[PDB]
């Protein structure tokens, strides 16, 4: 009947079943635990014993504890009743708002669709981010990867991607928070109450997003299965309701990292970088479900963390073959102040064929990449010599690329609290029109810092004359304002008397607070 | 009270294999009959693996192991303030038992999404290289990553010393109670910090959780979690905490020792597979709670030592992924005379200017921009090629600005003084000054400028236009050296 | 001037080929040592299971 725990080593639990072992990938429940502890069968050990990974902490497990087989994998609520809610890895609501409505709960484990029901259709998803929509344009229905090390702007970019393409589109959205900070998952939740994406209370059915969160405090068994839970909410919207759905996954690296934390305890020899041996096929089983089918379409945006600014590392390098657009963010673009710190050369899309986006978009993007590559081959000699022996053909392409570099920078609407500037949404036609001007010399007279953090090319001319006025207005405050104003600046002790003093208690309150908590509860 | 009994099968290298104890929980405190405690970590089908909290010399084959029924816990409360405790609760300063205290678990689930709010109020370090460029809010985990002797401890001690200076001036609610967890350190070194903290007065608000190098490897693995549990008393009851895990690099080495001796298979650099989970379980407990849960905060400062500036290290890469900001300290900046040796080009704060002083949010914005212009023009005049006289202006002004961010090791400046100091350097008032005596020019700028103009900038938190002109008209009635 | 820059820029290709030679010997030593280090990390994780 019911199995009993036989071994607890870290997050990996062995359960011995006297008769009819559960299937691999099936969900088990330990009763008698302090919290709901769900195990998932990873493998059959052989002597009527399964080896399992826990979806919660194994502190407090006892050998001999009763384990109940559910005869099924982990089943989560999917449907319209999850829109506007935050879910667990196992489908529990963690947003403190009742239970989830749960019309047709679904298993988080399934296969990839087929080869026959694949969609060979390419249409551009216009994001508004002009470095994205010029050089590596995203596909409406394809996988998008945001690469980069720690602190280059993977979230700031996936947050600007949320309020640009998910804030007004036809279908629903799912955010899969996979092994990241709980602080920024709370920042994402409260940002979407304010922008009306998630509505609380009786207006909950008009929500357009479902959060599934498996953040960094969760054990490796939990974080390995959150993306499968976020898939399953997005696969109900594609397969059953037949509609378009956006799926944002914050650091799909953490799915591969979580499987490697349990891998050696599952009895597997380590791989080349200390990763699990099944690293390419655990990742491949997840990505091949995030597809556009003949029923609907899943537009996926996955952040990918690279460990030490290292795209050579096998967990980002395996992800590269899965995506249709790989926006690579670089630290050297971030240290220069250009934000979004998108590497303009290393970012590659499959929408960059001339027979897909036209020739007026392909040749501008192929022309911007040529000027930015020539400048990098010249910057070997500029930092040594200093831009005097280039015979003014290569001096022109240094100043053209420096204008192009700042014109890829753009203020984000979600980085108003960071950058301090209002965000800009650049249309696709205004990006092609602007970069064709800088490429063909239409805007050589403007300063190169007039291109920095602006919307389009009509805001570079709106900023260049502003800059000239700003420096021609420096020589006017050198006459007055030092002495004897019109008393809008009063005396010092006038301001000290307006200071409303606080009560500085000087007792700390502590030992009477502690006994007050003691007599309470 | 039936007590389950386990017979020791074998004991070696601080690990004892125990037969029996079927009822024992994973992570449960056990008790040997020699008096030494233990923790049941891997419950195998034939034996229990017990890490020994102490010296395993007193444990013999066939000794009786009793289970205590309880997961590992520490005394938390206000009675731990002022005391020097060991890796799990017990005081080692020779001042008796911990009075007015309560035993709580050391492995608590971190507060989830609905229990947070946004990190908005600032935690002032007193280090003006930090509070201007990489400012730290209350509820934010910030890494102090650096080399073997780059002053990483000094940055952390100045955060603790400065909170005592702030706690005498703020009301009772917004007082920060510090916890310093010293993992794997020398005991002489810890005793120099308790000597410093009683001389400073910072020991009134400080808990000192000490797991030295002589302690067992499960006492240094467990000491960050036991110090965080003492620090989470203030977070959970509406007050504000500040936890400093000095050398989480030395906690992972103590956790690699127990994992390798419990026979767990080694990963990169012979480290456990769940090492990332070792530090993400701990650092995610540093939170800013919502006002339904009290509004309390806990600010973490993990310290990670690199080898040769190799931040691509296994444990170093893990904690850069977990923490919000990063204070990178460089060895060659340390000896160039830049103290603290903060790599401004590599140090970030992911909370950013949302949780910093408004009186420096407008002043230090041009500070980090002029220092960004200073960095690449100093790489080119390193060779000695040529000059531009607009390149030489930002190469000369940023040399004042780099010299302005230098600070004394044991003195933490108040936020009002730092903004005035940065104003006098970013509004050009510390031009006409030699680059060498700006370390001594700003003592005039703090002393001669009125002591009642700091009170207005402290109470408003912002240079008002009725103060923006009044203090720049006092930054001219000051006598600077040389001039 | 051009004939002293010619003798100066041939003394700095010598110096950037002697530095490059000491740096390739240093790189080949680190290339050999990192294949040995990553291999010992694989055998130790395999001997702990077998």
């Amino acid at each position: 009947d019911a199995g009993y725990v036989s071994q607890v080593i870290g997050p990996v639990v062995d359960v011995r079943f006297d008769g009819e072992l559960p299937s691999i990938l099936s969900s088990l429940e330990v009763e008698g635990h302090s919290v709901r502890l769900v195990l998932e069968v990873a493998q059959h050990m052989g002597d009527n014993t399964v080896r399992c990974i826990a979806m919660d902490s194994t502190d407090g497990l006892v050998r001999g504890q009763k384990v109940v087989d559910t005869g099924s994998p982990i089943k989560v609520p999917v449907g319209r009743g999850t829109l506007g809610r935050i879910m667990n890895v196992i489908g529990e609501p963690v947003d403190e708002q009742g239970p989830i409505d749960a019309a047709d709960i679904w298993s988080i484990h399934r296969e990839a669709p087929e080869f026959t029901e694949q969609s060979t259709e390419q249409e551009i998803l216009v994001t508004g981010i002009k470095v994205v929509d010029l050089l590596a344009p995203y596909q409406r229905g394809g996988k998008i990867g945001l690469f980069g090390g720690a602190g280059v702007g993977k979230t700031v970019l996936i947050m600007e991607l949320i309020n640009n393409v998910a804030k007004a589109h036809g279908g629903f959205s799912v955010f899969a928070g996979v092994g990241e900070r709980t602080r920024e998952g709370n920042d994402l939740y409260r940002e979407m109450i304010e922008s009306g994406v998630i509505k609380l209370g009786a207006e909950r059915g008009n929500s357009k997003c479902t959060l599934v969160y498996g953040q960094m405090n969760e054990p490796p068994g939990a974080r390995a299965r959150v993306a499968l839970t976020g898939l399953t909410v997005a696969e109900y919207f594609r397969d059953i309701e037949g509609q378009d759905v956006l799926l944002f996954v914050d650091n799909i690296f953490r799915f591969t990292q979580a499987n490697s934390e349990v891998s050696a305890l599952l009895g597997r020899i380590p791989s080349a970088v200390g990763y699990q041996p099944t690293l390419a096929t655990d990742l491949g089983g997840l990505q091949e479900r995030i597809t556009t089918t003949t029923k609907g379409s899943i537009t996926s945006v996955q952040a990918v963390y690279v460990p030490a600014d290292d795209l050579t590392d096998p967990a980002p390098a395996t992800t590269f073959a899965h995506l249709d657009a790989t926006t690579v963010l670089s630290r050297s673009i971030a240290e220069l102040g250009i934000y979004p710190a998108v590497d303009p050369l290393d970012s590659t899309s499959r929408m960059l064929n001339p027979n897909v986006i036209g020739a007026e978009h392909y040749n501008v993007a192929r022309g911007v990449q040529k000027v930015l590559q020539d400048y990098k081959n010249l910057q070997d000699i500029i930092a040594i010599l200093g831009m005097d022996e280039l015979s003014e053909e290569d001096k022109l392409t240094v100043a053209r690329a420096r204008k192009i570099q700042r014109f890829l920078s753009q203020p984000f609407q979600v980085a108003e609290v960071f950058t301090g500037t209002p965000g800009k949404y650049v249309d696709l036609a205004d990006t092609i029109s602007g970069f064709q001007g800088v490429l063909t010399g239409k805007y050589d007279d403007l300063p190169e810092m007039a291109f920095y953090m602006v919307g389009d090319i009509k805001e570079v001319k709106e900023k260049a004359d502003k800059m000239a006025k700003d420096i021609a207005s420096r020589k006017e405050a050198d006459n007055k304002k030092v002495s004897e104003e019109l008393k809008d600046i009063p005396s010092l002790d006038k301001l000290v008397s307006e200071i409303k003093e606080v009560v500085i208690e000087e007792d700390d309150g502590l030992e009477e607070d502690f006994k007050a908590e003691a007599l309470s509860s | 009270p039936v007590i389950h009994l386990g017979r020791v099968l074998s004991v070696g290298d601080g690990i004892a294999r125990v037969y029996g104890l079927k009822s024992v929980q994973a992570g449960e405190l056990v008790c040997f009959d020699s008096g030494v405690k233990g923790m049941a970590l891997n419950l195998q089908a034939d034996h229990v693996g017990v890490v020994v909290f102490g010296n395993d010399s007193v444990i013999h084959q066939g000794d009786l192991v009793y289970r205590t029924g309880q997961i590992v816990n520490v005394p938390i409360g206000p009675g731990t303030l002022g005391r020097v405790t060991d890796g799990l609760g017990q005081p080692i300063d020779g001042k008796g038992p911990l009075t007015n205290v309560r035993s709580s678990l050391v492995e608590v689930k971190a507060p989830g999404i609905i229990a947070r709010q946004s990190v908005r109020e600032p935690l002032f370090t007193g280090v003006k290289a930090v509070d201007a460029l990489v400012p730290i809010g209350r509820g934010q985990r910030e890494l102090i990553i650096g080399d073997r002797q780059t002053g990483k401890t000094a940055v952390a001690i100045d955060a603790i010393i400065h909170q005592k200076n702030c706690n005498e001036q703020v009301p009772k609610a917004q007082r920060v109670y510090c916890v310093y967890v010293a993992v794997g350190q020398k005991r002489s070194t810890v005793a120099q910090l308790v000597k410093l903290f009683t001389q400073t007065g910072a020991m009134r608000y400080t808990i000192m959780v000490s797991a030295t190098a002589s302690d067992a490897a499960p006492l240094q693995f467990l000491a960050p979690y036991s110090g965080c549990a003492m620090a989470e008393y203030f977070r959970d009851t509406g007050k504000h905490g500040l936890i400093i895990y000095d050398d989480l690099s030395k906690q992972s080495v103590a956790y690699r020792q127990m994992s390798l001796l419990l026979r767990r298979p080694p990963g990169r650099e012979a480290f456990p597979g769940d090492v990332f989970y070792l530090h993400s379980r701990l650092l995610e407990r540093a939170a800013k709670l919502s006002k339904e849960l009290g509004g309390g905060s806990l600010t973490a400062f993990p310290v990670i030592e690199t080898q040769a500036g190799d931040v691509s290290a296994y444990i170093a890469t893990n904690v850069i992924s977990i923490t919000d900001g990063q204070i990178f300290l460089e060895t060659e900046l340390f000896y160039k005379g830049i103290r603290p040796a903060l790599n401004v080009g590599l140090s970030v704060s992911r909370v950013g200017s949302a949780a910093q002083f408004p009186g420096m949010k407008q002043v230090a914005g041009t500070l980090k921009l002029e220092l960004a212009q200073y960095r690449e023009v100093a790489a080119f005049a390193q060779f000695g090629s040529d000059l531009d006289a607009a390149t030489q202006y930002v190469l000369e002004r940023g040399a004042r600005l780099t010299e302005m961010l230098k600070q004394k090791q044991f003195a933490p400046i108040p936020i009002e003084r730092q903004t005035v100091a940065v104003y006098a350097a970013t509004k050009g008032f510390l031009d006409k000054v030699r680059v060498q005596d700006i370390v001594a020019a700003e003592e005039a700028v703090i002393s001669q400028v009125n002591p009642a103009v700091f009170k207005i900038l402290k109470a408003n938190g912002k240079i008002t236009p009725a103060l923006d002109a009044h203090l720049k008209a006092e930054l001219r009635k000051v006598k600077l050296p040389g001039a | 001037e051009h004939a002293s820059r010619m003798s100066a820029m041939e003394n700095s290709t010598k110096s950037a080929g002697e530095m490059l030679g000491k740096l390739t010997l240093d790189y080949n030593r680190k290339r050999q040592a990192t294949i040995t280090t990553e291999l010992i990390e694989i055998i130790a994780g395999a001997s702990a299971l077998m």
């Binding site: 290292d310 070997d380 | 040769a308 190799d310 | 490059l20 740096l23 790189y27 680190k30 290339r31």
Partner: peptide
Amino acid sequence: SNQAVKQRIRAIKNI
């Protein structure tokens, strides 16, 4: 630390 020694061979080879 095997990329810092590889980016110096990037420097000295172009110098």
